[PDB]
Amino acid sequence: ALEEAPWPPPEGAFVGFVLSRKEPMWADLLALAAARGGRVHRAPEPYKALRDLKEARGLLAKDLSVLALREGLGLPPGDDPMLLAYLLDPSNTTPEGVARRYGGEWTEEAGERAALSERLFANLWGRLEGEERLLWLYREVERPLSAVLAHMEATGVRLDVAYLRALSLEVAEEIARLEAEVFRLAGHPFNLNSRDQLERVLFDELGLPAIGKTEKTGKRSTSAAVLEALREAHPIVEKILQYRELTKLKSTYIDPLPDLIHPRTGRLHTRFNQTATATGRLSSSDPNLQNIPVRTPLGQRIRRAFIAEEGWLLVALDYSQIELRVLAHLSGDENLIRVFQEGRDIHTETASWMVDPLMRRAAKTINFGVLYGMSAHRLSQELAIPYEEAQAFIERYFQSFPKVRAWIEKTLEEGRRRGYVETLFGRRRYVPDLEARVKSVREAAERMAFNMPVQGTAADLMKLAMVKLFPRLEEMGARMLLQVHDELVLEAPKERAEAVARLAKEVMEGVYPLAVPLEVEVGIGEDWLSAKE
DNA sequence: GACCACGGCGCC
DNA sequence: GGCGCCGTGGTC
Ligand SMILES: O=[N+]([O-])c1ccc2c(ccn2[C@H]2C[C@H](O)[C@@H](COP(=O)(O)OP(=O)(O)OP(=O)(O)O)O2)c1
Ligand SMILES: [Mg+2]
Ligand SMILES: [Mg+2]
Ligand SMILES: [Mg+2]
Ligand SMILES: [Mg+2]
Numbered sequence: 201a202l203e204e205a206p207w208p209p210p211e212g213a214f215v216g217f218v219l220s221r222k223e224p225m226w227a228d229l230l231a232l233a234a235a236r237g238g239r240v241h242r243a244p245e246p247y248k249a250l251r252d253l254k255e256a257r258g259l260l261a262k263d264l265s266v267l268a269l270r271e272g273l274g275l276p277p278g279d280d281p282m283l284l285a286y287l288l289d290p291s292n293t294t295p296e297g298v299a300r301r302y303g304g305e306w307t308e309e310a311g312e313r314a315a316l317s318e319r320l321f322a323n324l325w326g327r328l329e330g331e332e333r334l335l336w337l338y339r340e341v342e343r344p345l346s347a348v349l350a351h352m353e354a355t356g357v358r359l360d361v362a363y364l365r366a367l368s369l370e371v372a373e374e375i376a377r378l379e380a381e382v383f384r385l386a387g388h389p390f391n392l393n394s395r396d397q398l399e400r401v402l403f404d405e406l407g408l409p410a411i412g413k414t415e416k417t418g419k420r421s422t423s424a425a426v427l428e429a430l431r432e433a434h435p436i437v438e439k440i441l442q443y444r445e446l447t448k449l450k451s452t453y454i455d456p457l458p459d460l461i462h463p464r465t466g467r468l469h470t471r472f473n474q475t476a477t478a479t480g481r482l483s484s485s486d487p488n489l490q491n492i493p494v495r496t497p498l499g500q501r502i503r504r505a506f507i508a509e510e511g512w513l514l515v516a517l518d519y520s521q522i523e524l525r526v527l528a529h530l531s532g533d534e535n536l537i538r539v540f541q542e543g544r545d546i547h548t549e550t551a552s553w554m555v556d557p558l559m560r561r562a563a564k565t566i567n568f569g570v571l572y573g574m575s576a577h578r579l580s581q582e583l584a585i586p587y588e589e590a591q592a593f594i595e596r597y598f599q600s601f602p603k604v605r606a607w608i609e610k611t612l613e614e615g616r617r618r619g620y621v622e623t624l625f626g627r628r629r630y631v632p633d634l635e636a637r638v639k640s641v642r643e644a645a646e647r648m649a650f651n652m653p654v655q656g657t658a659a660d661l662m663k664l665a666m667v668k669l670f671p672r673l674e675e676m677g678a679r680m681l682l683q684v685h686d687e688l689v690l691e692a693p694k695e696r697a698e699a700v701a702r703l704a705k706e707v708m709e710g711v712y713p714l715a716v717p718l719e720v721e722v723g724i725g726e727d728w729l730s731a732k733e
Numbered sequence: 734g735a736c737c738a739c740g741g742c743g744c745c
Numbered sequence: 746g747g748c749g750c751c752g753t754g755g756t757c
């Protein structure tokens with residue numbers, strides 16, 4: 201790309217671009233270039249130059265596509281060396297790291313970024329050649345998904361701003377009641393948001409027993425777990441837990457979200473990061489819309505602020521127990537497979553032992569938590585029960601589901617020999633510490649390693665389903681808005697919502713037939729909370 | 734102003 | 746197990 205040639209570039213060229221800020225819905229496009237065949241082409245006027253491209257091909261392609269969609273241009277993302285690198289090794293998460301590893305330097309200049317995209321793609325493509333399964337994942341899942349995500353990002357989701365504003369004032373008044381009570385009990389005001397100040401008050405001034413210490417600096421912890429244990433030692437504790445809940449939700453959702461509404465769309469626009477996790481899941485940021493509250497009453501009130509466009513409805517679809525079903529398929533356990541083929545339910549079953557949607561959620565931490573290496577001592581204090589018999593409550597699980605333990609053992613042994621583990625579709629995660637000589641490190645690694653094929657296969661299935669579903673939705677005049685790992689949120693014209701729900705449900709359930717059926721629960725509503733029933 | 738480590742905590 | 750964001754106490 202050494203030789204400068206006039207804009208525009210020939211087709212197939214790789215693009216480089218510089219944004220005033222990371223978020224493509226908010227960014228000014230500062231510069232735009234393209235590189236091909238020993239030539240680099242710099243655009244004199246980036247916005248207008250955008251009209252010359254047939255597709256965004258290069259590093260961070262989806263970001264340029266989103267910005268183009270923002271500007272009303274149907275420019276899809278194409279090849280992206282980040283996706284190749286991320287499939288080769290999902291620790292490849294940044295252009296900085298990928299450049300250093302595969303043969304260049306990530307700079308702040310568009311031409312250089314275009315030249316770099318071209319060279320990295322050449323080096324990665326060949327590496328990803330011969331890896332037929334990763335190649336299939338690239339062509340059939342990741343590359344097409346990037347176009348789907350680009351449209352989700354540019355579309356956004358409507359937020360009831362007036363509602364959240366009123367909710368803010370109400371929550372502020374309750375926070376004031378809580379602070380005032382805490383200060384009376386402490387005998388003096390202090391910064392209740394400072395865990396250092398709180399630690400002194402609880403443990404030095406009120407003489408409460410310390411329970412645990414913090415990881416890096418060894419302070420006496422004031423975490424929810426510690427406070428819960430101290431709930432009956434002093435009236436101040438309950439008030440602090442309530443304060444923690446309200447301030448967490450006010451500072452993270454109630455106050456920030458209304459300020460993130462885009463002036464042009466009137467909606468909230470998240471970023472779905474495609475090379476961000478060790479397992480093949482997506483992440484969401486700026487804002488994060490994959491962690492909107494749902495558990496507590498105030499949380500639920502916040503979830504109600506997410507609403508459909510006037511005259512449309514939200515459709516929410518959630519895979520049922522997807523990780524357990526995946527485990528059944530991967531392990532081949534007959535008992536577990538039978539549980540699903542018959543129609544039994546695992547989450548609800550542990551719930552009654554320990555049933556509405558509230559007490560069923562708590563079961564999720566249990567069944568799942570125990571499944572992924574949770575120590576009995578953990579389950580003990582997490583279930584509020586005697587540490588006995590063993591274990592015990594965790595035991596026998598492997599007895600009734602024997603093939604699961606065997607799958608775990610085989611997964612680890614293979615991970616030790618090859619240095620990585622894989623999903624059903626061959627997505628890999630390298631786990632070098634499986635051979636660490638320090639037990640705590642090695643066992644932490646083991647839990648990461650055997651988790652990945654389960655979490656990652658579930659992620660693979662959801663991505664493939666999004667790729668299958670997206671074009672059907674366009675045809676029906678419906679929109680895909682959000683993904684939350686095992687859930688999708690769509691928006692449909694009211695008259696069509698029912699037909700969309702039915703279709704979307706079939707597509708997600710039939711995505712890839714397993715030894716067990718995939719089941720999908722679906723709700724329709726004017727807001728996110730009511731759409732999940 | 735920007736950025737950092739940490740503890741803490743929201744969701745799957 | 747997997748994420749990203751917040752306020753505090755802090756540096757530059
Ligand atoms: O270790 N943990 O504590 C732990 C580990 C994994 C966990 C959770 C809580 C959820 N997951 C995983 C497992 C699932 O893939 C997804 C959660 O999905 P979900 O909340 O919709 O619960 P499902 O298991 O899918 O069942 P459900 O949708 O019918 O309630 O994320 C907790
Ligand atoms: Mg589910
Ligand atoms: Mg779910
Ligand atoms: Mg951290
Ligand atoms: Mg400060």
Ligand code: NA
Nearest residue numbers: 323324325326
């Ligand atoms: Na290559």
